[PDB]
């Protein structure tokens, strides 16, 4: 079924050899590589629709926004900017080292490893791949085995665009991953849970391999007394229930000022009941196990269910759920939920709200603050370390090529997208020229 | 002697609490912190001169250039620019997320850890510290154990400038280091050997701690036919034998075209036997145990000694030595020498020279090329991965704040100096504001 370790070693060796050919050095090569990836993605749209529907119940419109469209936009943006990015940057020379001409080169790493997660398998495998490509690297991709249909199409896309010595997909489970992690890769890009990130970095240490880790945690959505409540409910609906809550930058929990909680939940519960009435309205959880995990949490919570909490394990379905009266103590606040459940906590003092986030779940991937006072909103953001942040918005910062997407501490290290992907998949090389 | 684990934990805990105060937020505080650092260094030069002469036999002018002057120049560069650096950067917003306003914030990591090497203990502890400071972090510094005198002065300099809740020195050995590496630091800066880099990274993995590793390797100095032999010998004399060859960016070995090898070696050997005649002309090796290691290598060499070889383990000294007729097989081409020995190898064409360096000792911290054909010299540099590179010069690239300094692969991960220190000691936080 999966490649044997021998064939994996052999595939790895052919990429090492291919890189040493310096085939990837010129920008003309890198640009046509992007054109071939783009073309291969477009050729396989319909297969991606079916694969993502089967694996995760993703609607076609979502796939076009968050999966296919996200990648194609990054590709087009990279193509229009690559000539600028690969150009040597000349710097001044101080007098102590004069006379000399100095400049900075962004130099490729070599053979790279991309580990793909289940939840947005196209976005989070192929967008970093763009990084590897424009940086002048080769790449081995291991998509998630828990989304088998889309992993197969990803392999088909890559096989169709590229020779395996340049870019290859290796499907596999635990055993194939630990084997690949033991190889002397030159760069490793991982997207997944904090505990597996620890495993990836530990393996990376043994070969001194630099890593980027895009991890998780619990993103708060904080609602100030002066927030536009319809706007807030809209973003909650979008952010919390897209892909059954299986999003790294999804609002994990709601942190609302006591004085607008009743009015907020009234709007929210009504819209959930109206727009998400079916048990599989949000999509599918990736595995039956995940549904059972979430059901146990619901069975253990001290909060009050306002809507939902209906589950069909065999369907991999859990209805959109809102749970009121939750404390930091609650089972729903122990771990990242990654499910269509929204626990609701209350605050009065903004200073205390800040402290509570920092104390219980610090450094999330994103902090969301909803309100009309920008000083108060920005002030909250500036006092909560997080990967990224938004005021009166959700998720869409990850779809901008101008913004460095990445976490801090337990939510990760390193950033990418746009120019930042290029800088992430190269190292800075100083050059000093003496006459 | 050394602080107990209980007080180390107690010291670490206080920096966490102090960072949480947001004391380090405003740029004014950071600028004053550098001023206090600068004055503390200046007010202690004499003690540094003595300590460094005692530990390593460093001449006053070497200390003025590569130690005291190096961090003073960085401090002044940082002070002159920091106001511009800390200002949030507004970025474009694509139409897909309109309407919104977006910007990037460079946000401090928190409590950082700086491990100092023996060979340049002032430069490679205080220059990273500058980054820690201007990043808005706190810092715990552990200087090398093997240079008692200077480490003691560093502690004095740091205590003079800073309260221990902000920046603190903790002297110690392997046991103190492994205990510090077990604490939940928010960032670790390491300078040292590759094998210890693995230890540091493996420990950082357990807390998802981002690292920068400034490591080792064997920097080649490659000599083309039309090179200036006078220039070449001057730079070798300067680069190879400064601090007894205990320099990370020193030319470890000489790699010279066959047609000029004899002429170059006549010029080089004559200069060595006259300018470096005594057993301790180059200075002191760090330990007696090091001397013994170097001598043993000379015993096993298949190459012909041309000068020096004489050594005195008792006074931590070894004579400037040039070894001719060396192949990659040789016991002198196995490890990083880090001593007063210059092995000399030879090649028949540029093509073979490039391929042999990449084959036997790839990714060194620096590649040096001497010749007057720039297209050829650059051509070599472009085909050998390395942290940094020079044509017709050595070492001085590390003394320009406009140049990022750092390795690749075995020579390390990450860069610093100048603006790059600010960027390394912070993370990029995207912020999107929706009306
Ligand atoms: N910052 C971001 O960009 C981002 C994006 C999406 C998700 N996330 C985070 O990812 C997590 C959820 O996604 P996930 O369930 O796919 O994370 P995951 O469990 O860490 O899996 C990620 C990848 O690593 C493999 N894997 C899982 N457990 C492993 C283990 N003990 N040892 C070795 N490999 C292992 C997986 O293989 P298989 O799946 O094939 O078994 C998968 O390919 C959440 O924490 C989320 O916040 C972050
Ligand atoms: N890229 C750069 O910035 C740069 C510049 C110059 C030199 N270097 C590198 O520095 C290296 C040599 O210096 P060094 O001997 O001081 O490096 P080192 O042996 O790796 O030690 C560096 C630090 O780690 C501690 N340490 C050493 N060995 C250890 C072990 N086995 N376990 C745990 N901790 C350990 C040391 O404490 P104690 O020393 O107090 O015992 C010291 O503070 C060379 O490889 C050179 O290439 C790098």
Swiss-Prot record, chains A, B:
The keyword Transport does not apply. Pfam families: Aldedh. It is an enzyme of class 1 (oxidoreductase). GO terms for molecular function: benzaldehyde dehydrogenase (NAD+) activity; benzaldehyde dehydrogenase (NADP+) activity; nucleotide binding. Belongs to the aldehyde dehydrogenase family. GO terms for biological process: aldehyde metabolic process; mandelate catabolic process. The gene is mdlD. It comes from the Bacteria. GO terms for cellular component: cytoplasm. CDD domains: ALDH_F3-13-14_CALDH-like (cd07087). It catalyses: benzaldehyde + NAD(+) + H2O = benzoate + NADH + 2 H(+); benzaldehyde + NADP(+) + H2O = benzoate + NADPH + 2 H(+). NADP(+) binds at residues 116-118, 142-146, 174-177, 192-193, 214-215, 248, 336-338. Pathway: Aromatic compound metabolism; (R)-mandelate degradation; benzoate from (R)-mandelate: step 4/4. It comes from Pseudomonas putida. This is NAD(P)-dependent benzaldehyde dehydrogenase. NAD or NADP-dependent benzaldehyde dehydrogenase that catalyzes the conversion of benzaldehyde into benzoate in the (R)-mandelate degradation pathway. The active site is at 214, 248. Keywords: NAD, NADP, Nucleotide-binding, Oxidoreductase. Its EC number is 1.2.1.28, 1.2.1.7.
